[PDB]
Design a protein around this motif. Sequence first.
Motif, PDB file in Angstrom:
ATOM      1  N   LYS C   3       0.825  -1.202   0.000  1.00 18.71           N
ATOM      2  CA  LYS C   3       0.000   0.000   0.000  1.00 18.71           C
ATOM      3  C   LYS C   3       0.860   1.254   0.000  1.00 18.71           C
ATOM      4  O   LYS C   3       0.464   2.282  -0.560  1.00 18.71           O
ATOM      5  N   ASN C   4       2.041   1.189   0.619  1.00 16.41           N
ATOM      6  CA  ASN C   4       2.961   2.320   0.576  1.00 16.41           C
ATOM      7  C   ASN C   4       3.374   2.624  -0.858  1.00 16.41           C
ATOM      8  O   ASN C   4       3.387   3.786  -1.280  1.00 16.41           O
ATOM      9  N   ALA C   7       0.406   4.202  -2.732  1.00 15.58           N
ATOM     10  CA  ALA C   7       0.297   5.625  -2.434  1.00 15.58           C
ATOM     11  C   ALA C   7       1.408   6.410  -3.117  1.00 15.58           C
ATOM     12  O   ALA C   7       1.182   7.522  -3.610  1.00 15.58           O
TER      13      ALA C   7
END
Lengths: 331, 237, 305, 49
Positions: C3-4, C7
Amino acid sequence: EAEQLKNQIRDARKACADATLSQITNNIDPVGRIQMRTRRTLRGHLAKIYAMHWGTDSRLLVSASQDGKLIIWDSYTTNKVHAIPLRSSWVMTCAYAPSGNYVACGGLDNICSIYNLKTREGNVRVSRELAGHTGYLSCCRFLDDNQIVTSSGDTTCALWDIETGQQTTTFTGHTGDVMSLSLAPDTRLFVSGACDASAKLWDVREGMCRQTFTGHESDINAICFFPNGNAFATGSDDATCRLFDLRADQELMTYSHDNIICGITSVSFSKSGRLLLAGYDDFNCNVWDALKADRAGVLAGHDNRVSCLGVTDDGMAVATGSWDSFLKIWN
Amino acid sequence: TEDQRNEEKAQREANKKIEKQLQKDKQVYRATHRLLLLGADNSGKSTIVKQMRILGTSGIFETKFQVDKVNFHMFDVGGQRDERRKWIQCFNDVTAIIFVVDSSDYNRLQEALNLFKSIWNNRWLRTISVILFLNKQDLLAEKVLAGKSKIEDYFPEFARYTTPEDATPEPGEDPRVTRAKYFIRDEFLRISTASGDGRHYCYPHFTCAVDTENARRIFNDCKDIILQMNLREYNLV
Amino acid sequence: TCKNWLAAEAALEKYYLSIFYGIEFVVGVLGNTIVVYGYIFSLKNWNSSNIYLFNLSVSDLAFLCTLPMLIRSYANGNWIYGDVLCISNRYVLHANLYTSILFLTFISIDRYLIIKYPFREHLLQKKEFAILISLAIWVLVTLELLPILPLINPVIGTTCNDFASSGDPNYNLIYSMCLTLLGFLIPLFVMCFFYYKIALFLKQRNRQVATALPLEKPLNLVIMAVVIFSVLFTPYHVMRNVRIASRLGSWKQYQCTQVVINSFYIVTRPLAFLNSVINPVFYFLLGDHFRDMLMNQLRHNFKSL
Amino acid sequence: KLVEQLKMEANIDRIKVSKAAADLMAYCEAHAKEDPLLTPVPASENPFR
C-alpha cells in the motif's frame, strides 16, 4: 620659410573670425526630431555596397558593390534597369553622368571605367577605360558627358576627357590618399578630402589648388558641398564632421557627440542645406542641424556600416547604401 | 489604358531578367573563395602568383586557380602605394589573407613581422585568418649553411632559442637550418598568438622557389579556415 | 509496504507529472519561440543544417503545445476534453517526440558532412535535399505512429489513459518494442556512429593541423550531444517496454511489483520530455553566432517598438 | 615646392566669418519650404507615396 606663411595664414583666419556660427545660431529655432522612414529597400547586391549616386532626374540611382556589380535602380518602382558586371570586382566608387547617359566606376583597379547606357546596341558596354592613376581610384564625378574628375589613392586628382581618353589636368598637393571629392554646383571648382586630414579646393579650369582647410585630426573619408557652393562639409575617422566655408577660409562648425567614437563614411546635404546627413561606422546615419549641430534624427536600420549616402537633387529622398548591401531609401 | 502599362510591364520584365542573372551569379560568388596576397616585393609573391596562374592588368592582379572542383580567386595588390590602411578595408570579406614573407633577407624581415602585426590586429581584419608562407627557404638554407647568417644580431633572442619538440624537419636538412627556419616561424606565430580571441588563425608554411604544392596548401588551409567558420555557424564553436 | 508503493505511485502521477510537465512546458515554449523568431525574422542565409535545426525546433514546439491537456488531466485526475481530443493530442505528442529524435539524428549526419565536406559539395547539403529529407522524416514518423491509434483508442466516461497502460498488453508491447527499435535505437545507433566519426575527424585534424587549434570545445559538444540524448531517452524507452511487459499475462501477477514498475515508468516520462526543453539551449542558445544574432535582432525589435 | 603654392594661396579675398555664417543662414531660410526633407511634403504629390 613655410612656417612664416603658415603663421600669416593662421593670423589672417583669426582676424577674419569674430563670432562663431554656434554663437550667432541661438536666434533660430531648432528643426526638431525627424522621423524619417524607409520608403524603399533596394536589395539585390550580392556583397557589400561601397558607393552609390543619384541621377539628375532624381529617379534612377547607380550603386556599386564589391561583388563586381553596378546596378542601376529605378527608385520609384525598385526595378533594376541595368546590372553592369565589372571587369574588376573591387569597385570603390561610382558616378552617374548629369545627362544620365554614362556611368563611371573606379576601384582598386586604378582605372575608371565609363559605361554607356543610352547605346544603340541596347546593351551597356565599357565606352571608355580611363587609365593613368598610380593607385586605387577612390572617387569619380562627372562634369559633363565629356569630362570626369577622378580622385585616386596616389594622393592626386585628375580631370579627364572621355572623348580622347587621357588626362586633361592633374591636381597634386595632397600628402595622403584622396578619399572623396565633391563638385561645386556650377562645376567650376571642386573640393577633395584626403587622408592627410586636409581638404583642398581646386579650380578645374586652372588646374591648381586655391585654398586648403586642415581642421581635422585624421583621414577625411567623406566630403560634400553646401548647396549654394560657398561652403562644404567633411567627415573624418575621428567621428567628427566639420563645416568649412570657402570665403571664411576656416572651419565654421563642428558636429560631434560624446557617444560616437567611430569615423564618418559619407556626408550629404539636404536641398535647402539646413540638414547634414552623415553615415557612420556605427551601423547608422545621423542627421545634423547644419546651423545648430543637433542630431535631428537617426536613420538606423542597417545591419552593417553605412558606406554611401546621397540626397536626390530634388531633395525628395535620401539613399543610404551599407555593407549589408540593401541600400535603403529614406524620406 | 496602354500608355503607362506597356512601359511598366517592360520594366518588370527587365527587373526579373536581371534578378535571374543575379541569382545565377550569386552561386558563383558564394562558391568562389576570395584570397588576398600580401608580402614584400623582395618576397616570391609574384612567382607564387604565376605558379598558380599556370593552373588583372593594372593595380590589382587577380588570379583564377582551381583545385578539387573549387575555384580560388587570389588578389595580388602589388600595384598600390606603400601605405595600405585605406584599401585594406575592401578585403574585410576575404576568406584568408595569404602572407608571403622572405625568410632569407633578415634585414628586411623585422619589417615583415611588423607588417604582419599590423595586419593581425587590424580593425577590419580581426576576423580573417592569415595563411603565412615563409618563402625562399632554399635560399635561406644555402645562406645559413654557407655562414655569414648572423641572425642572432638582428634577433638577440635567437641565442636563447632551441628547436621546438613538435617540429617535423626533413631527414636530410642541417639541424642548424631547422633551428633557424623554425625560429622565424615562431616569431610570426608569437605575433598571431599574442592577439585575437580565437577568431582568426595563422598557418605557417615553408616553400621553396618552385613548389606545385602551394595551391594545395592554400586549399587545405582554406578548407580548415572555413571549417572553423562552419563550426561557429553550427554553434559548435 | 505494498500500500505504501500504491500511495507513492498515486501521488507521483498526481503531482510529479503535473509539476514537471508545467516546468518543461514553460521553459520549452519560451526557448523554441526564441529559436523560431531568430530563424524566421533573422538569419536569411538558410541551408541544410538550418533547415534541420528549424524543423527540430518546430517539432519541439508542437511537442510542448500538446502538454497542457495532460498537465490539467493529471492535476485534476480526470480527463474531460472528450475522446477525440485525447487520441489526437497523445498521437501528435508521440509523433513529435520521434520526429525530434530523427531530426537530432539528421543534425548529427549534417554536422559530420559539413566537417568532412566544408565546401558544401556532397550534394546532400543542398537546401532542396534537406527539405525533401525533412518532409520524409515527418511523413515517416506519421506512418510509424499509425498503429498507436488502435492502442490509445479508449473504450467507454473517457477511459483515455497513457500509451503504456492502454490496449492489449501483448499488442501494446510487440509495437512498443518495434517503435523503440525503429524510433530510438536505430536513430541512436546512427547518431552515435556519426558523432564518433566527428570525434575521430576532430582528433585527426588536431593532430594533423597543429597551429594552436585544440578544438576541445567542439569535441565536448558532440560527446555531450549524444550523451544527453542517450541518457534522457534510454531510461524512458527501456523502462516503457518493461511497464508494458508488466501487463503481459504470461507471468503478470505480483501486484506490488507492478506498482513499483508503474511508478518507475511514471517517473521516467518527464525525463524523456526534457530533450524538448534542452535542445533549444544546447543547439542554439549555448553557442555563439546565433545567440549574437538573437541579441542583435532582439535590440532591433526594441528600437522598432 | 610649397612656398610658391602658399604665396598664391595667401592672395585670397577673405571675408568675415560672421558674414559667411549669416549668408549660410540666409540661404537656409530662403529655401526652407523647398526642402522635402526639412518640411515633409504630403503623400499626395510625394513620388514615393
